[PDB]
Amino acid sequence: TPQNITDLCAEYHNTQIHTLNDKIFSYTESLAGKREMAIITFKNGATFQVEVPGSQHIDSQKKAIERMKDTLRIAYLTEAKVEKLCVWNNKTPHAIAAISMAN
Amino acid sequence: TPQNITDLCAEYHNTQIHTLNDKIFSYTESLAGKREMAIITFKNGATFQVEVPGSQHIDSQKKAIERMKDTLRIAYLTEAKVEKLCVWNNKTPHAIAAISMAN
Amino acid sequence: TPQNITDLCAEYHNTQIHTLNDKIFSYTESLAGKREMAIITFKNGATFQVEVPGSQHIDSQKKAIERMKDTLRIAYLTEAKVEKLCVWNNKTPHAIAAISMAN
Amino acid sequence: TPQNITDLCAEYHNTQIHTLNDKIFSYTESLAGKREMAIITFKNGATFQVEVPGSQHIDSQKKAIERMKDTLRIAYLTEAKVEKLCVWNNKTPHAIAAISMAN
Amino acid sequence: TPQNITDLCAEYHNTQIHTLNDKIFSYTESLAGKREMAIITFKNGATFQVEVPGSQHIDSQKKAIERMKDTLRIAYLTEAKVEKLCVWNNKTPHAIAAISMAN
């Protein structure tokens, strides 16, 4: 069981770590069919998505996808600093697998 | 997969972007039968709804609809600046498909 | 489709609008069986409930009843000004159908 | 239908009202099997639980049990003043049935 | 039924109490399949996880695991002081069984 976001991100090829140490610049949320997703950006220009839940996601993952969108919204609205994002780099925007918040 | 609300909105028919760059002026919600909905207004008069859930709303739209109502409520209470809305404009009040917030 | 809380309230029999323009004075919540409800009051002594879910409600209302209790709790804790309430006046305490918040 | 927590408490056997008029000193929460519960304390020593969901609860209470734990958690973090608690006194710690918060 | 986290912790095997009396330093969350988990750390270097739900967890534990991650997130964002953690010391990181917060 990984002890931090780096070790978890290492479990996957084609994921990569981004260190932002910054608050989210914008938060975008959609309920449109087949675009039930979230998109965040940072002032450095970086853009990331939470994937649309699909048949490729087991049910436990779909539930965690909903959690992640909860986390990003309240992080945005509290101006909480994001430390790192672990993101799949084979999707555009890169897709969030894990997030850390610290200080 | 789009990277922002404007490109996401261009992927559908019967949608348009509204640019507000303002906080929500009023939040209204109802539990009354057949009107289980939320309504928001802006000081310029613009009025929008989150639609009552129905049979046109498909799989994971059901969760996204509830999340949107959560988001509008917490956005209203935090006075978060709303940047743009993607809305379905074949309904009145315009039905929100997506929202973007930027400081 | 109604555009605001007053038009919405007009669509139902035995309802009326209370214009409070004030924060919630008390929030009360119960989990006891058959009394799973919420009660709020205002400075002026006005008392309102969120009814227990029962046979008078249709399936579409079930999530909305839970949302409304969420809304009243966070409204109370933020000291948010509630503008109007649409209530069924054939219940005691009057039963909330819709809420608007502005300011 | 009762109009306040005191009237609601009197509708049940083995209940009593505690008047605290104080914020919550401590919030404890457990996910261990058979102890999925919450325990709160006040500064005077009073200790109360939200019971583990079991057969003694009707289905309607399950949702309300989860809500009560949500409410105690956020009440604690916001240092909200708890007015009164309705509890079952045939359980140790006394088990919460209803809570009133008042400004 | 135990009256505090220390007594609750003693009911289980392979558990131990950690007394932190500090806010959470970092909150980490993953949505990767079969890694749906949360990790928190404190400035004393202690690292703890909320376990991935599965097998070891009955029905009521699943709900409680999700609640626990909700609680740690909002505790982190509010910088609430956590008093103690009851953890299974037969997992790495030690897995959280219960949390106490005291203000």
Residue numbers in the entry:
A (entry chain B), B (entry chain A), C (entry chain J), D (entry chain I), E (entry chain C): 1 to 103
Which text from the study accompanies this structure?
A conspicuous exception is the interaction of monosialotetrahexosylganglioside (GM1) with the carbohydrate-recognition domain of cholera toxin from Vibrio cholerae: this is one of the strongest protein–carbohydrate interactions known. A conspicuous exception is the interaction of the human ganglioside GM1 with the B subunit pentamer of cholera toxin (CTB5) from Vibrio cholerae, an interaction for which affinities in the range from KD = 4.6 × 10–10 M8a to KD = 5.0 × 10–8 M8b have been reported. The crystal structure of the CTB5-GM1 epitope complex was published in 1994 by Merritt et al. and reveals important H-bonds between the C2 C(sp3)–OH of the terminal galactose and Asn90, Asn14, and a water molecule (right).
To establish the importance of a long-discussed key hydrogen bond between C2 of the terminal galactose of GM1 and the B subunit pentamer of cholera toxin (CTB5), the total synthesis of a selectively fluorinated GM1 epitope was conducted in 19 steps. This problem was circumvented by crystallizing the protein with a disaccharide and then exchanging the ligands in situ by carefully timed soaking with high concentrations of F-GM1 (details can be found in the Supporting Information). Crucially, F-GM1 was found to be bound in the same binding mode as GM1 with one crucial difference in the terminal fluorinated galactose unit. The OH → F substitution at C2 of the terminal galactose led to a change in conformation. The quasi-axial arrangement of the C(sp3)–F bond of the d-galactose enables a Dunitz–Diederich-type interaction15a,35 with the adjacent GalNAc C(sp2)=O (3.4 Å). Moreover, this permits an interaction with the side chain residue N90 of the protein (3.6 Å). These interactions abolish the formation of the important hydrogen bonds (CTB5, Asn14, and Asn90; Figure 5C versus Figure 5D) and confirm the working hypothesis.
